[PDB]
Design a protein around this ligand. Structure first.
Ligand SMILES: [Zn+2]
Ligand SMILES: [Zn+2]
Lengths: 116, 56, 107, 158, 98, 202, 91, 196
């Protein structure tokens, strides 16, 4: 939804319905600082979520000795060495799909076949 | 166990003892069987008191 | 100097000979906020030392704004005399340097 | 508005502006950088606290000063009992007219006096001073100056 | 167990000072937006600040413990997933040698 | 060594000009640039004072206005007690920082309240650039966090509590816009502006 | 000398430990009487166990071949060894 | 290295998952009511909201946790000053012997000497305490978003064993506290009644 803040007192902005132009304006509730909203979306509430599956991936994820090793094909540099792990979200209904991270180019590629 | 890699779902990684008692247990299998026996002892200890309660 | 606030009786003119206004004419001076290791802070913050003597030279290489220190030998020999002044911000916002001075309660 | 905010005035002056967040790193190529590394290793090696001290002498020698002992205390610390018991008040029966004139003089000096202040002012025995008080004066019972002897209204005019 | 020992606990203050003298930025002047990859540094459960290059710090600390400059009972843990460097010093921790 | 740079020598400050003055560190907190030479209404006043019961204190412009107008108008003892142990330095800090640093401009447009920071105030030193490009070393002692106060017409607490009580309904989204349209509990700068324009019109 | 290291349960969370040096460390016909050894097919170990039998306590170290027993029997023997009879002290 | 007192700080997420008005309230010691978070961060000198959820959220792309902390900043919205927050948290102080103007100093004492006391006891350390509280809330919301599971209470690393050292330490601490109290009582008596 990409919350945006006031540039004066660093408070979050709030939408307004106005009959002057019927356009989406976001206002600061403290110092009356106003701008146009760049998107009609003002609220999103996602129930089933794929965000957090690739969470925790860093530049030195290959330095972890506890992560298992595999020999899958990395389709950006064609490397035969990588680490892998399951989806990092801890929902009871997430799958066993693996997220292979190549160590040569830090490319994250999965093993899901229906999505591919 | 810290002797396995992360996200290992192999039978030996999650408590399948393939050796018999005659051939002896690998230490991971030994610890897993100790966990199972500990569960059995705890269940016996709670079940005796609870069933005596129910019987009285 | 404990004193009553919001004095509209203009008693501050009689009991304080110095002006209460902040002095701003040194605000245009450029200051470098420098963080020191423990030994350098110990020799650069002791009150039994620092009698105004020079401590070193600052080499500012203009090729890539690389700033290095060339300390004098007046302090020690076991410590290094060349140091690298790393910068994480070339422009520091909303940060100034100010001093405090006690007022004159007499006359 | 309220004309009281408790402001402590002090002379203040801006003495410059900072534009560079500077930090000092020791140079790797300096020969004395290894002295700094060894110094930091000595810092993380040294201990700030020492061990306890074990008395290696005979235990009875240590216990001789303890509790049930010959060695009476020779310290003067907090000996308020001996230094407050050395002040003794001794006085005799001075004749009645002199002490009543003294009481009248003190009543003229200030009308209300307690027992202790009057006794330390006149240096007289408590029984005789009490007799000379209730002969010619009385103490307040329920007033704001209660438990203080004041002159009678009959003698107040003089 | 037979080989398990229990830490008696040492002072964490030398460790905190050592961290502060090796690029562990103090928590007072840390901004997450300008340092999004910074690894939080915990000493006995106290967040003391962040470090930009946690791997070099961890290998330095491990070499120091292995050479005995740090007390061997001091346990240092780098969890790479959420970028935390936890260092434990207090007593009561059961450890075993490996 | 060839001199392809500008090697300015570094000198220390004497110890004679360090006693009876303390060189602290200023630090504002705003996403925009704050500059007292431009953004502040001169004269600017900085003193350590009580911040208790703000929005009721008039700034120096209205103070000298009131001074001018009144110049025109006039012309059993408990014996022993426990004494808890406390270190001298922290006691001095607590008594000193019992009142915060508050710096304001003349009209009260920019009121900044200081907060003490002790995290790394001891490891910091100042290298002021001299008039000839040289550097003077000043050992900094304290660092103060300065925050602007009552810039967007902040309010009191009793109204906030009665809005947070559940006897009333949902709090409206644009309440202080309506209140500023009414004209109640404005900024200190606007409150000084109303009195200044009332006095100056006569 | 950095040859052995003290590891607690937090530090166990971020390391990989081998059972035996002669088995799991070097890069990889078998006796049918021996138990099946899995080599874990991965060589990124940071530590190795000193000896796996050292996971037992004092009482369980008395049991001969405790890996060939049902675990509750080992627990019973561990509890029973305190009731054994023998010399407890030489004095 | 202090009074060896144990203070429990609970950061609790009110409202169920099906509920939409999910606000976070923290259980401060010596305070009757559970204070919302934003009031506490403003009481720690972090007045503007942006730095508050900067202390909460370290990844600007993690929009979901920002969404679910939006009702918290909406709830702690009427308070926009540090001193107002200080009065608001000090008015439910469990003292009932403090006046109007001493509420601020009382709440400052509450937040300094026993709010996260394992970090520091001194003043001028509100920034690190605020960062740690933001870290606590970040862990709470990571568990609420199921990015991380709840903490295992049976994990042996999270456990300590009090041996003869620590046990005799706390016992001797209690006994020496009592002995110092007795010495002070004896001193007070021998001054007030003066029998040496
Ligand atoms: Zn605004
Ligand atoms: Zn690749």
């Amino acid at each position: 939804t990409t919350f945006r803040f006031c540039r004066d007192c660093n408070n979050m902005l709030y939408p307004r319905e106005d009959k002057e132009n019927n356009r989406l304006l976001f206002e600061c509730r403290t110092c009356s600082y106003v701008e146009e909203a760049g998107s009609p979306l003002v609220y999103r509430h996602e129930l089933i979520t794929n965000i957090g599956e690739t969470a925790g991936v860093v530049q030195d994820i290959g330095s972890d000795p506890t992560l298992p090793r595999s020999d899958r094909e990395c389709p950006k540099c064609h490397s035969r060495e990588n680490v892998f792990f399951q989806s990092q979200q801890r929902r009871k209904d997430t799958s066993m799909v693996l997220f292979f991270v190549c160590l040569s180019c830090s490319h994250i590629f999965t093993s899901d076949q229906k999505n591919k | 166990l810290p002797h396995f890699s992360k996200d290992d779902y192999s039978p030996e990684s999650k408590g399948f003892v393939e050796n018999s008692y005659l051939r002896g247990l690998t230490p991971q299998e030994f610890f897993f069987h100790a966990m199972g026996g500990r569960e059995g002892l705890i269940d016996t200890a709670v079940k005796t008191a609870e069933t005596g309660y129910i019987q009285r | 100097e404990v004193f009553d606030g919001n004095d509209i009786e203009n008693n501050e003119t009689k009991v304080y000979e110095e002006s209460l206004d902040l002095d701003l004419e040194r605000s245009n001076r450029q200051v470098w906020l420098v963080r020191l290791p423990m030994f350098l802070a110990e020799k650069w913050r002791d009150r039994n030392n620092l009698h105004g003597q020079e401590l070193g030279k600052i080499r500012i290489n203009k090729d890539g704004s690389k700033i290095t220190l060339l300390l004098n030998e007046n302090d020690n020999d076991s410590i290094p005399h060349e140091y690298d002044l790393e910068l994480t911000k070339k422009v520091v916002e909303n940060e100034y340097v100010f001093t405090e001075q006690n007022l004159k309660k007499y006359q | 508005y309220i004309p009281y905010v408790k402001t402590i005035p002090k002379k203040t002056a801006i003495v410059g502006t900072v534009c560079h967040e500077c930090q000092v790193m020791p140079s790797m190529n300096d020969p004395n950088y290894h002295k700094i590394v060894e110094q930091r290793r000595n810092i993380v090696k040294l201990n700030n606290k020492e061990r306890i001290t074990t008395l290696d002498e005979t235990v009875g020698v240590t216990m001789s000063h303890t509790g049930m002992s010959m060695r009476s205390d020779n310290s003067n610390f907090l000996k308020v009992g001996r230094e407050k018991a050395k002040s003794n008040i001794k006085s005799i029966r001075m004749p009645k007219k002199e002490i009543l004139d003294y009481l009248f003089k003190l009543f003229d000096e200030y009308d209300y006096w307690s027992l202790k202040g009057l006794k330390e002012r006149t240096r007289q025995p408590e029984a005789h001073l009490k007799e000379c008080l209730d002969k010619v004066a009385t103490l307040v019972k329920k007033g704001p100056y209660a438990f203080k002897y004041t002159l009678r209204p009959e003698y107040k005019k003089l | 167990s037979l080989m398990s020992c229990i830490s008696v606990g040492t002072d964490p203050m030398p460790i905190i000072t050592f961290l502060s003298e090796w690029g562990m930025e103090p928590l007072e002047d840390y901004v997450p937006h300008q340092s999004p990859d910074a690894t939080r540094v915990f000493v006995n459960g106290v967040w003391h600040g962040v470090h930009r290059n946690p791997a070099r710090l961890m290998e330095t600390l491990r070499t120091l413990r292995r050479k005995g400059d740090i007390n061997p009972e001091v346990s240092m843990i780098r969890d790479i997933r959420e970028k935390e460097l936890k260092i434990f010093t207090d007593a009561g921790r059961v450890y075993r040698p490996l | 060594d060839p001199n392809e740079y500008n090697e300015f020598p570094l000198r220390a400050i004497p110890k004679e000009d360090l006693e009876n003055m303390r060189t602290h560190l200023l630090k504002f907190q705003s996403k925009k640039k704050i500059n007292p030479v431009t953004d502040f209404h001169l004269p600017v006043r900085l003193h350590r004072k009580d911040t208790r019961n703000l929005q009721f204190q008039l700034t120096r412009a209205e103070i000298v206005q009131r001074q001018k107008e009144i110049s025109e108008y006039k012309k059993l003892r408990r014996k022993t007690r426990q004494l808890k142990v406390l270190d001298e330095n922290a006691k001095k800090l607590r008594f000193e920082e019992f009142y915060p640093w508050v710096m304001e401009d003349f009209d009260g447009y920019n009121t900044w309240v200081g907060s003490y920071e002790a995290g790394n105030s001891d490891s910091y030193v100042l290298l002021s650039v001299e008039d000839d490009g040289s550097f003077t070393m000043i050992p900094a002692d304290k660092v103060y966090k300065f925050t602007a106060r009552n810039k967007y017409a902040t309010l009191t607490i009793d109204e906030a509590e009665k809005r947070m009580d559940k006897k009333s309904g949902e709090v409206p989204r644009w309440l202080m816009k309506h209140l500023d349209n009414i004209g109640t509990t404005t900024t200190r700068y606007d409150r000084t502006r109303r009195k200044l324009k009332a006095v100056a019109d006569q | 000398e950095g040859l052995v290291e003290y590891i607690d349960a937090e530090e166990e969370e971020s390391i990989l430990i081998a059972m035996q040096p002669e088995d799991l460390e070097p890069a990889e016909d078998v006796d049918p009487a021996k138990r099946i050894r899995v080599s874990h097919h991965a060589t990124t170990f940071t530590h190795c166990e000193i000896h796996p039998s050292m996971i037992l306590g004092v009482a369980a170290s008395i049991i001969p071949f405790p890996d060939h027993n049902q675990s509750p029997r080992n627990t019973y023997q561990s509890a029973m060894g305190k009731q054994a009879m023998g010399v407890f002290l030489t004095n | 290295k202090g009074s060896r007192f144990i203070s429990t700080l609970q950061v609790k997420l009110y409202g169920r998952e099906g509920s939409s008005a999910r606000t976070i309230k923290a259980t401060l010691p010596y305070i009757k009511q559970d204070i919302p978070i934003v009031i506490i961060f403003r009481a720690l000198g972090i007045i503007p909201d942006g730095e508050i959820l900067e202390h909460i959220c370290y990844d600007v792309n993690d929009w979901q946790m920002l969404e679910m902390l939006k009702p918290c900043v909406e709830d702690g919205f009427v308070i926009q000053d540090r001193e107002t927050a200080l009065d608001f948290i000090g008015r439910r102080g469990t003292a009932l012997g403090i006046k109007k103007e001493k509420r601020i100093q009382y709440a400052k004492d509450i937040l300094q000497k026993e709010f996260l006391p394992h970090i520091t006891q001194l003043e001028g350390f509100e920034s690190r305490k605020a960062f740690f509280l933001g870290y606590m809330i970040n862990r709470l919301l990571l568990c609420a978003l199921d990015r991380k599971d709840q903490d295992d209470r049976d994990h042996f690393g999270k456990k300590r064993l009090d041996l003869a050292g620590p046990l005799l330490a706390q016992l001797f601490k209690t006994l020496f506290k009592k002995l110092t109290k007795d010495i002070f009582r004896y001193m007070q008596r021998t001054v007030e009644e003066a029998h040496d």
